[PDB]
Design an enzyme around this catalytic site. Structure first.
Site, PDB file in Angstrom:
ATOM      1  N   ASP B 490       0.795  -1.229   0.000  1.00  0.00           N
ATOM      2  CA  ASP B 490       0.000   0.000   0.000  1.00  0.00           C
ATOM      3  C   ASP B 490       0.830   1.284   0.000  1.00  0.00           C
ATOM      4  O   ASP B 490       0.310   2.357  -0.290  1.00  0.00           O
ATOM      5  CB  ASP B 490      -0.932   0.019   1.216  1.00  0.00           C
TER       6      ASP B 490
HETATM    7  O1  LIG Z   1      -4.796   2.363   4.606  1.00  0.00           O
HETATM    8  C1  LIG Z   1      -4.104   1.278   5.205  1.00  0.00           C
HETATM    9  C2  LIG Z   1      -2.605   1.369   4.972  1.00  0.00           C
HETATM   10  O2  LIG Z   1      -2.139   2.557   5.646  1.00  0.00           O
HETATM   11  C3  LIG Z   1      -0.735   2.795   5.442  1.00  0.00           C
HETATM   12  O3  LIG Z   1      -0.405   3.978   6.086  1.00  0.00           O
HETATM   13  C4  LIG Z   1       0.090   1.639   6.031  1.00  0.00           C
HETATM   14  O4  LIG Z   1       1.471   1.850   5.766  1.00  0.00           O
HETATM   15  C5  LIG Z   1      -0.355   0.300   5.430  1.00  0.00           C
HETATM   16  O5  LIG Z   1       0.277  -0.772   6.124  1.00  0.00           O
HETATM   17  C6  LIG Z   1      -1.878   0.134   5.520  1.00  0.00           C
HETATM   18  O6  LIG Z   1      -2.272  -1.009   4.778  1.00  0.00           O
END
Ligand SMILES: OC[C@H]1O[C@@H](O)[C@H](O)[C@@H](O)[C@@H]1O
Ligand SMILES: OC[C@H]1O[C@@H](O)[C@H](O)[C@@H](O)[C@@H]1O
Lengths: 822, 822
Positions: B490
């Site tokens: 992500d």
């Molecule tokens: O929206 C969810 C995502 O937020 C990000 O800030 C994180 O680094 C990810 O691990 C998470 O899946």
């Protein structure tokens, strides 16, 4: 029961115990940096936007309430205590909190050691400064270690409270024990990425130790009241890596009997140009130049005192525009100090952040800020001017507008809904009030964009025509303005019909079609439509003005023909075309809004206050009888006892609270003004006293909230908690009550070409003098008031009698002595 | 080192002290009602949706952490304490917390009184039941008063924490001291309006007193640890009106030496048909029929015990599908109990609510729920089938899909982003895993709509073709699939280029254009594209199948020709066609995702584990050297030390945490599986142990979080907190680790036309027996493992040797005994 008292000479409210009914706060700052400070040092600080640039963390609905803020733990031979009482709650020999204008002083003393802290946001600075004075009041030497403490917030308050999955790993700090003026801690979360800003927390001395990790400072399983570090007597010199960053320095002091020591702490917001963000080529160390400069400007107590003095002079100057001297010290206190102080706060905060509004979903309201201008234009017109431009810039080409805009970016959003049809007209109200005050007709020429669209600018005046036309081209079958999402009353949603739980009526999608109309907007249109007409005429738009007045006459005609229930004004017509607020229904028979606003517009006014046959008199009489309580006027009666799906949010509140039977103070001044219009000053003043802070101080245990500022709502007669307030500080109640008392009760109000002097306050205020600076001239208005109903004033200026009650503006620099006889 | 221990026979983890490194929780419920319960009774409960139907309030980031939950204040002669230690923190003679499967027991004893509480959510019930046993362990008769306590949440958790301006006036309750089975308190906020549901908190005895107002129960200025009512020793019988509603009953108990008494408390969620909501015509009294019935179902200890045993039988049955008996009890423990238990939790919770995820913004992620199926299909295939349908119903007609959907409505939303190009293929992964497990080919014919649209239904298989086609038609200049917003990672946002702070990289609008490609999606496509082909072949689509495998061939070729950096696979190509994850760059040289997934897809595999010329081997060797640490494999190396504008969120994390150098456990099983594919079982088992709970229990003071479940991330090598975990419980790490250990290490994995037994775990597990129920038959797999590198198994079934490692599925009811020699 009282928990303090007013100190008029010092312009402060003195809280004499920590044990108040609820946390009582003050607001620090009046420019771009603000602090919410409770009488227990609780609260937080932010730069321009409480949601996007919050420096420190605060927990709403904490147990107990307000356990978190700027603390100073004192370790005296092992005994740990805090002068603000909370969070440690150690027995204090003396305690006192003084909330002043832009500053507060909190003092606590225990076992021969007194610690006084002056809190304030200096003019021109984006920082909160604390000047701590520790005094040995015993007859023997004392040695104690003082631990400062503040908990940082990760800038985006919303992210801070909900996105731990990410943010527990991003907290970053830098520690500077040996800075140029003392020790400092830097909170720089996300500075490595998109943020060009960081916070600093330093002290004007080389600290013995420090701490930047909350868990280490407080200790596992401990609350702030049981913090391990202070109890241990020495800092742990913790360096945070994620989790919860804090700012804390320890300073050991030794004082002989009677000796004192000063310490100056600074919490500052700093920014660096992108190309100047880092001290090193590798971009790992923050450029501290602006922080070192800030700490240098407050390295001595002398510098602090100079800033406080400048702040005091700043307020004296602001409060020099309107002041009164009468036989009522509660009235004078409100008019001369507190109501005006509160109007500056609402101008800056709108309805965004208080100890009730969380500083997240709400920014600067279109309706809210326009109305706040009404009680703020005389204070700093140049800033009211810019605010008007910022507000009008979030308006759409068709006349409608974003309900609010983000403080940081000044861009509108629909976070709390859209399609409020009363919004457009409030812009005209604001501009009119500003022009009457300043005479700055040139503002109408100011180029203003629509929805901040570069290149879409049109004169401000054109924006007003869009607002006016929006209402003209949006009337229902009765000729009354269509309500849309809702009018002034956010809970009167006639195009909702929601059966989905948990979804905000404010944001939930509305149903198209229907014929829902609002009697309130009709009155609002008549009142402000006339001002538009006037502005168009002065602009040389004769046809436009003529046309505008035709529409105005049509709408007011509709109110009298389709908005009258018999003994009061109708509230509206629902989606089905059925009347709302009629005696034909068992509940919600009479609503207050149109009663006050229709009469303010002059609809239904008769021969005089004794004309019991004039609609206005009948309406106000119904208001008195059905909506009156010793705590103010309830919104409607009877309150709804079951969910009325066609009305929206209103009936969701238990009877007696908020918009369903609660005393929504904001609309009480409309009835007050209406009463002065019909010539019943005695009754108008009566209503004013029922909801005004200085008059309710003696029942502080009932009001519960701050006894020096207005609150949004006081529980109504149908509530078990009748008389108890909620949502203090941020409310249009401040601006409107100031308009009511200063312009209609005391009767001194600015008009386009002259200053109106039309007292209508009743026999309780037989004699008084108003000093009013308008258009660069000072008006000394001496009033001799009999208070006889229907009795209007006759004027004499500089020795010669004049015609009417409008004193044409004298040239700047002159002093006009007006003798008023009522 | 250790704060408790596993109790395998009881299937529980025993925490022997309240002083753990961090609150350790358990999840109660497996159907529609859930509870988060810490070893100190902290947490909350909700029905189906943690955001829209939260019954009780819980404060994240509280000081101290976890101060709030189901408390039972014991007042013994003026001394007040709680068996859960917090919030009072009184010295306990004994304390213990046992977290079991769907239930927990917390016991505390002080001065002759032992109080044990059994917490659990009964099967088929939307409620949390507490069976409290108070025992007099002294030699003299004792008496005491017990005060129960739970703080209600106003259903909408988001509104609850931020909209006080409204909700402080809506809290409503009902008190029923003399109910059919005892006393009960009703929390009915907004039942007056759109909610057809209320909560009840009752006890199976007529309580001496009660309290529903928090402030009255706790007292002004007090924390939960200083509650006034318990200290006074008498309930104040408060009836809430707004503010903070709670549930509390006082019960006087008397006990002879050695005597005990049971009390059963119930927190239930009830609903009434719209036409049966009220008991009175006026509609002011809630219909308590369902509540009374619920309370009656738990009026005796016998009923509670019967429900607990049904729960135990329920779990014994669920865990009867896959079991192992080996020489490694830490391995057995994980495989037989905990990993499977966690997979049930992730299946139900996804990534919505834990002590890290706040149960507000995150619903059910498309990618997340598809991967969770991989480790859940063997548990309850019928529910897995249902989940697949719900998931695919939120897919768009072009193949893409909503990144997540709201649990209460099963409707998709973009609250946490959209347009992640790896999402589509996960649908194929989930279906394939489900078909292999169940053999339910009929699911492919199930009509499924697009974005829950009426009339859009097409067979599920078509949904898979849309997913497959989306990738083929969305490849860049190298023949690799375009990444879009991001792929599995992500934080790899190649189309972002954000310079505006606060704006989530996950939601901010991406820039169009560019040629950003993902090597991870390439490997994912090769892996699941093949599965798609197989599904098509079985359906008789030789045409579709043939073309599909050709595309897989093209992408596979693309990876080897354009996705190879020399010693490891490339990660991606940015917006400008620049390579990401190459040795030519100073930071972010090697990323773990493509290494594990490319090999899992069989890309770069050679002649064996010693084929030093094979890309797969070179890649894995690089992983071991550059990403290996005692706590697992970090995502990439080296971590980024400065903000890389073109990479998105990844470089915003300080080095060693989360996506920037942290050990993102979820992707470690890919390397584990990859190592088994290449024939290096020993190394694969090594990696498995580095991140598995049972093996890390000995360093609980370092892992910090629960020693019985996987966590999302463990601080990496470059972090000062290396070895410390965050975000426990809710992570795809559970599903993928179960897949790895049960299907590749132990080697028992369902295939389309048979059960493959391909052990590859190394020499550390010389012998073991797996009991696997598949397609209605029971397979007893006796394995004799040499652990020799590259050595793979030879099988003999029921006394008859066979060729290959796939045992065709025997008829249901059969018991096949397979002898395995490795
Ligand atoms: O929206 C969810 C995502 O937020 C990000 O800030 C994180 O680094 C990810 O691990 C998470 O899946
Ligand atoms: O959007 C804010 C609005 O929320 C409603 O629930 C309240 O009843 C209004 O008083 C308030 O103005």
């Amino acid at each position: 029961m009282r928990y303090g008292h007013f100190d008029d000479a010092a312009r402060e409210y003195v809280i004499t115990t920590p044990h108040t009914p609820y946390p009582w706060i003050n607001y620090l700052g009046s420019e771009q940096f603000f602090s919410l400070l409770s009488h227990q040092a609780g609260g937080y600080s932010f730069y321009r936007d409480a949601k996007m640039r919050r420096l420190t963390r605060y927990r709403y609905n904490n147990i107990p309430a307000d356990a978190g803020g700027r603390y100073l733990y004192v370790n005296d031979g092992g005994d740990v205590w805090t002068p603000s009482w909370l969070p440690v709650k150690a027995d204090l020999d003396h305690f006192e909190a003084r909330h002043g204008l832009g500053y507060s002083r909190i003092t606590g003393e225990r076992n021969g050691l007194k610690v006084e802290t002056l809190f304030f946001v200096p003019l021109g600075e984006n920082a909160e400064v604390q000047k701590v004075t520790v005094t040995n009041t015993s007859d023997a030497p004392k040695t104690a270690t003082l631990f400062s403490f503040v908990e940082f917030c990760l800038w985006n308050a919303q992210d801070d409270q909900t996105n731990y999955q990410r943010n527990l790993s991003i907290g970053e700090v830098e520690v500077e024990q040996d800075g140029p003026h003392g020790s400092a801690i830097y909170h720089k979360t996300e500075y490595r990425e998109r943020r060009d800003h960081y916070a600093v927390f330093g002290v004007n001395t080389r600290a013995d130790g420090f701490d930047t990790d909350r868990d280490t400072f407080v200790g596992a399983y401990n609350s702030l009241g049981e913090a391990s570090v202070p109890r241990a007597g020495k800092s742990a010199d913790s360096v945070a890596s994620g989790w919860y960053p804090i700012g804390s320095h320890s300073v050991a002091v030794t004082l002989q009997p009677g000796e004192s020591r000063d310490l100056v702490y600074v919490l500052g917001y700093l920014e660096n140009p992108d190309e100047e963000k880092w001290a090193d080529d590798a971009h790992q160390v923050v450029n501290k130049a602006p922080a070192h400069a800030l700490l240098g400007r407050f390295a001595t107590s002398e510098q602090v005192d100079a800033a406080l003095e400048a702040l005091n002079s700043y307020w004296t100057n602001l409060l020099s525009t309107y002041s009164v001297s009468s036989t009522d010290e509660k009235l004078d206190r409100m008019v001369n100090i507190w109501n005006q102080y509160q109007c500056m706060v609402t101008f800056n905060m709108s309805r965004s952040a208080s100890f009730f509004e969380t500083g997240i979903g709400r920014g600067m309201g279109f309706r809210d800020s326009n109305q706040d201008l009404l009680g703020f234009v005389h204070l700093i017109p140049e800033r009211a001017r810019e605010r008007i431009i910022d507000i009008a810039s979030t308006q759409f080409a068709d006349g409608s507008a974003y309900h609010q805009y983000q403080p940081l970016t000044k861009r509108g959003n629909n976070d709390i809904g859209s399609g409020f049809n009363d919004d457009p007209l409030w812009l005209i109200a604001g501009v009119a009030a500003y022009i009457k005050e300043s005479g700055d007709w040139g503002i109408l020429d100011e180029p203003v964009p629509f929805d901040n669209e570069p290149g879409s600018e049109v004169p401000l005046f054109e924006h007003l025509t869009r607002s006016f036309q929006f209402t003209v081209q949006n009337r229902g079958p009765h000729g009354l303005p269509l309500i849309g999402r809702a009018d002034w009353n956010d809970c009167l949603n006639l195009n909702c019909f929601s059966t989905t739980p948990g979804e905000s009526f404010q944001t939930t999608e509305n149903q198209a079609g229907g014929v829902a109309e609002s009697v309130f907007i009709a009155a609002q249109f008549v009142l402000y439509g006339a001002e538009y007409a006037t502005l168009a005429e002065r602009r040389g738009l004769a046809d436009v003005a003529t046309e505008a007045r035709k529409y105005v006459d049509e709408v007011r005609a509709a109110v009298l023909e389709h908005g009258w229930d018999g003994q009061w004004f109708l509230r509206a017509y629902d989606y089905y075309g059925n009347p709302v607020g009629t005696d034909a229904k068992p509940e919600g028979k009479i609503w207050i809004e149109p009663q006050g606003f229709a009469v303010m517009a002059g609809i239904g006014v008769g021969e005089g206050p004794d004309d019991a046959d004039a609609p206005a008199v009948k309406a106000l009489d119904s208001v008195n009888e059905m909506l009156g309580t010793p705590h103010g006027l309830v919104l409607q009666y009877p309150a709804y006892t079951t969910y009325q799906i066609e009305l929206g949010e209103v009936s969701t509140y238990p009877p007696g609270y908020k918009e369903n039977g609660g005393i929504f103070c904001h609309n009480n001044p409309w009835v007050i003004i209406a009463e002065t219009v019909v010539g019943r000053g005695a009754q108008a003043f009566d209503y004013y006293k029922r909801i005004t802070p200085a008059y309710r101080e003696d029942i502080s245990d009932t009001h519960k909230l701050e006894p020096y500022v207005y609150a949004q709502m006081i529980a109504g007669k149908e509530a078990v908690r009748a008389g108890e307030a909620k949502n203090s500080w941020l409310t249009g109640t401040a601006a409107w009550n100031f308009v009511a008392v200063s312009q209609y009760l005391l009767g001194v109000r600015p008009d386009y070409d002259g200053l109106v002097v039309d007292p209508q306050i009743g026999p309780d205020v037989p004699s008084y003098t108003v000093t009013r600076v308008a258009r660069g001239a000072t008006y000394e208005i001496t009033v001799t008031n009999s208070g006889a109903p229907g009795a209007r004033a006759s004027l004499t200026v500089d020795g010669a009698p004049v015609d009417g009650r409008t004193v044409p503006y004298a040239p700047a620099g002159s002093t006009v002595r007006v003798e008023v006889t009522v």
